[PDB]
Amino acid sequence: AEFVPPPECPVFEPSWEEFTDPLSFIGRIRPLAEKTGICKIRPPKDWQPPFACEVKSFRFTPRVQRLNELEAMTPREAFGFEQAVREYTLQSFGEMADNFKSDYFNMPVHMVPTELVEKEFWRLVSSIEEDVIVEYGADISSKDFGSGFPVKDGRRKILPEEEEYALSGWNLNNMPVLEQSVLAHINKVPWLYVGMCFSSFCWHIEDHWSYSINYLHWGEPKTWYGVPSHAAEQLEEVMRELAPELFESQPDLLHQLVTIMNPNVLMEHGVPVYRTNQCAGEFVVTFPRAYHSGFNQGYNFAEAVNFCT
Ligand SMILES: CCCO[C@@H](c1cc2nccc(C(=O)O)c2[nH]1)c1ccccc1Cl
Ligand SMILES: [Mn+2]
16 A cells, blocks of 8 residues: 555765766766666765855745645636745745654654655645645756856855865766757756755656756755666656546647656556665766656755766
8 A cells, every 4th residue: 555665776886986087987887777767876975065055145936836736637716826936045945844844744854764755755646635735946047046066167266175076077067068969060057956845856858868967965865766768668658548638648848747656656567666865965867768756855955967978
């Protein structure tokens, strides 16, 4: 009855030698990681970049997420006016996020097991008797208040011990993003995600089937689910079979806005699914055409960008 956690995706702990170049390292781990879709990379213990966002000015309006919006399809009065998008700071969002989680579980936020938040998230997604609503500071451009990584653009001070991280290849601002094409001869920045408990992103692949790299700067873990690219057509078949008929014929770019599905449903149809808990300071790499989704365990701050090889 309860949620069955998928098997864990690979976790790599590269030495300082292997950590020298990200593209070479990802190319070496590819024979295994491309068979799981996603993988986690723990940097060496002494690799600790600072947080370089403009915190004093960081203001955002997170989007409202109703967990059971799809199960509710199968009309309430004044639908569409459930909750307005409101402005937070990092501090005020974190206070709201911690208060929500501690009130919901009746525990301190860091004492709640990750398996319990996971089991409760999927129960709420399919629940018609309990309407839980959360907020997600998602798709915040790094050009607004700066990247979480230090950058040498002359906008914010960089200490001498921090210059290493502004020049590091693992700095998401230093990832290659320019795809090769003839049009490029004839003629992208990271995004930020401020999460709270139960805030989520649904199943999707990247534009142009691109790689993606994701870094959790700080906070509570981000829970991931990934499908290897060799099962991409299997997942899309399961989606079309079980998606509402109103959304079944929608283009993939639009359907990916509401592609929420319990991983056990995919596993029961033969789709291989892997999971991981991405903790603060760890990278998650998604491979080409690897479907992925997930949710946040609590107040956290992530940075993501598509990169090309
Ligand atoms: C309201 C959340 C927005 O969801 C993003 C999103 C993608 C993504 N990929 C990796 C990690 C996260 C993460 O929220 O941490 C992601 N969020 C998204 C979901 C489906 C389709 C397209 C887009 Cl743009
Ligand atoms: Mn993604």
